[PDB]
């Protein structure tokens, strides 16, 4: 049987990668970071509180100018926040209230959102009269949209519930490149600092690395236990972290091709919803389903702080490009900024 | 310097805040419902009598605003996007009572929804659809009861149960036996936070919206009593 031979060929190939990965694992990150100093207890207090959203907040994104941010809530509203003065800047109604993600253009001229409607919408913030209007609607996905990130004013990468990721041309509205290979639902994605590659996680306890320029899966990472909910790139672009339903966070390396460090605790039996790093990459901040956010020492895997200023589960998290503040959203319809 | 710009920013905030205050009144004035069901349940006819990945339908009963969402064109894996309906007023569940052991599959789906941690505070309205088809199959002896579920041999009509006018006892036992199957799961893991409302309905029953309106009234009434801690 050809199918049996192919299964045996795949099994032998999987064994070869396991042997190759085993040889490179002469040590672990914990052993290397054994003699370094701990980061110390991290104490942070809320500085700002943004109110006005009606339903639960599902996503948020910082701008490049580090004071403007956009947030999405499931009541069908996009609000642009001036974090310095707390004043609202824009209020964009949505065609569908079941929004699941939002994004901010690097130039600050556009915002994007998407959800259960399988459509990604682009809004123009620099209209002649100053009133926000929709600019383009991208369609073609057969599943709910989970995340989207801009590359420039004309390009964007999206992820969907159809186990597929795609790259779009905003001006023409066409799908330039399609990424396939995942078996489970794709929940999050993050672009590299040079925007030449991006990583994503799916509901199959696996992560994959893609090449944007020519559209193939370069590397595949396993080791997690359940569906992966969050993913983000390390500041240097040579590592990434993943949060899963197994109440355990993990760190990977693109050159080592295997797991480097695992973050877990006995009392934590709830999954991770959001993951993000700091500017130096020494601190790893993650949101949890138990209505709090914890701070992890990436090098030492020791919990260095806890944020418990939310009445519901933390659904989104973000760090400014300047590294000067951290903003978190939750199902209690409140945005909190910490420093 | 920047005081003029700062004043211009605050006047923009207050203008936005007035619109958001008006939108808050409208948002709370409508009740959101999630329409869910197994295959061949007939929910398409129900939603018809009151591509994109979701559908919307608006209807009014006694000047009350309702907004029903039908989740279509989505993948069969459901454990992720089901969490978006954790705050809806109620979840309408439609099953094929007449029916490869499709009834067992519906029971497992109902059990998972009932025991989901994010849906433990949401009540479920259950419609035992295809009542007419169930009666015909039972009369002709084609229904596969006593094969899917051997428990039908020892089952008896409930004491508080009342048969329909002119209804033969054979179909009355069959329809109630399926009804108690869902109640067995509903009874367990219940602490009064959510309830189940089973109804025997047909695909073309025009009074389905009235059943939802009455069931939503009870849910709201119990919700108010819970805040005052009377219950």
């Amino acid at each position, epitope marked *: 049987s050809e199918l049996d031979q192919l299964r045996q060929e795949a099994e032998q190939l*999987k064994n070869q990668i396991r042997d190759a990965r085993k040889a490179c694992a002469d040590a672990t990150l914990s052993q290397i970071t054994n003699n370094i100093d701990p980061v110390g207890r991290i104490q942070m207090r809320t500085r700002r509180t943004l109110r006005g959203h009606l339903a639960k907040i599902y996503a948020m994104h910082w701008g490049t100018d580090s004071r403007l941010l956009v947030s999405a809530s499931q009541d069908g509203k996009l609000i642009i926040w001036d974090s310095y003065t707390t004043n609202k800047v824009h209020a964009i109604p949505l065609r569908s209230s079941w929004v699941m993600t939002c994004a901010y253009a690097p130039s600050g001229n556009y915002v994007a959102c998407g959800g259960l409607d399988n459509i990604c919408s682009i809004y123009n913030l620099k209209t002649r009269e100053g009133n926000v209007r929709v600019s383009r609607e991208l369609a073609g996905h057969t599943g709910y949209l989970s995340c989207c990130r801009f590359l420039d004013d004309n390009q964007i990468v999206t992820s969907s519930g159809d186990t597929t990721c795609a790259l779009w041309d905003i001006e023409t509205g066409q799908q330039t490149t399609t990424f396939t290979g995942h*078996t*489970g639902d794709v929940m999050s994605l993050s672009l590299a600092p040079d925007t030449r590659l991006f990583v994503s996680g799916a*509901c*199959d*306890a*696996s992560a994959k690395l893609w090449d944007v320029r020519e559209g193939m899966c370069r590397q595949t990472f*396993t*080791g997690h*236990e*359940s*569906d992966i909910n969050a993913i983000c790139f390390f500041p240097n672009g040579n590592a990434f972290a993943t949060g899963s*339903d*197994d*109440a355990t966070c993990r760190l990977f390396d693109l050159r080592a091709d295997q797991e480097l460090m695992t973050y877990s605790h006995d009392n934590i*039996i709830c*999954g991770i919803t959001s993951v993000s790093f700091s500017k130096s990459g020494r601190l790893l901040l993650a949101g949890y389903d138990d209505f709090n956010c914890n701070v992890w020492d990436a090098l030492k895997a020791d919990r260095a702080g806890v944020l418990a200023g939310h009445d519901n589960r933390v659904s989104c998290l973000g760090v400014t490009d300047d590294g000067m503040a951290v903003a978190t959203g939750s199902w209690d319809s409140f945005l909190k900024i910490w420093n | 310097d920047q005081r003029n710009e700062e004043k211009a920013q605050r006047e923009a905030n207050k203008k936005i805040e007035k619109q958001l205050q008006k939108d808050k009144q409208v948002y709370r004035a409508t009740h959101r419902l999630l329409l869910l069901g197994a295959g061949e349940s007939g929910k398409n006819t129900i939603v018809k009598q009151m591509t994109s990945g979701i559908f919307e339908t608006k209807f009014q009963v006694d000047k009350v605003n309702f907004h029903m969402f039908d989740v279509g064109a989505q993948r*069969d*894996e*459901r*454990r992720k996007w*089901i969490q978006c309906f954790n705050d809806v007023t109620a979840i309408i569940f439609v099953v094929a009572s007449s029916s*490869t*052991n499709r009834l*067992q*599959a519906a029971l*497992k*789906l109902f*059990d*998972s*929804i*009932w*025991n*989901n*941690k994010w849906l433990r505070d949401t009540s479920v309205i259950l419609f035992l659809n295809k009542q007419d088809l169930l009666a015909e199959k039972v009369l002709a002896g084609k229904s596969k009861i006593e*094969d*899917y*579920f*051997p*428990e039908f041999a020892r089952y008896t009509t409930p004491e508080d149960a009342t048969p329909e006018p002119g209804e033969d006892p054979r179909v009355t036992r069959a329809k109630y036996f399926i009804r108690d199957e869902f109640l067995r799961i509903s009874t367990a*893991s219940g602490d009064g936070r959510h309830y189940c409302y089973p109804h025997f309905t047909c695909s073309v029953d025009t009074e389905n919206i009235r059943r939802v309106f009455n069931d939503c009234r009870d849910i709201i009434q119990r919700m108010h009593l819970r805040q005052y801690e009377l219950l």
Partner: nanobody, 128 residues
Framework: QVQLQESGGGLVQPGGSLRLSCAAS????????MNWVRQAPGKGLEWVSD????????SYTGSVKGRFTISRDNAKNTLYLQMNSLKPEDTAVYYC?????????????????????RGQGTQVTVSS
């Protein structure tokens, strides 16, 4: 990588007996609920039986009650299905499935067309 490998089964006379063994590796076996799912030829996935984390709770589908029996071994990280008095209808491909979440009672997508935590399965044929 999460792996579920099944073993056993094969040709059997009607009214005979068979034993199915599920080999579990790569995950904590005691933290998850396990289910048995079979697929008859020309039909879709169907749920057969399940067992709780510690084995205190057991449930079967009505059509196989008494005939089949499910057991779990935490130490060996394996799951069993004892089959007795097999009928011709019992012929199908039996898969070993896991619930997607740990420390959780409910679990979805077990009988879905595509599932990331389902085994390859073994073929069971009942005929003379």
């Amino acid at each position: 990588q999460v792996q579920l490998q099944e073993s056993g089964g094969g040709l059997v006379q009607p009214g005979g007996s068979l034993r199915l063994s599920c080999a579990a590796s790569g995950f904590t076996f005691s933290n998850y609920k396990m289910n048995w799912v079979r697929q008859a030829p020309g039909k879709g996935l169907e749920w057969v039986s399940d067992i709780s984390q510690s084995g205190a709770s057991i449930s079967y589908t009505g059509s196989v009650k008494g005939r089949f029996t499910i057991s779990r071994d935490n130490a060996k990280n394996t799951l069993y299905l004892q089959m007795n008095s097999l009928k011709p209808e019992d012929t199908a491909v039996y898969y070993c499935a896991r619930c997607p979440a740990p420390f959780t009672r409910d679990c979805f997508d077990v009988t879905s067309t595509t599932y990331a935590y389902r085994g390859q399965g073994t073929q069971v044929t009942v005929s003379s």
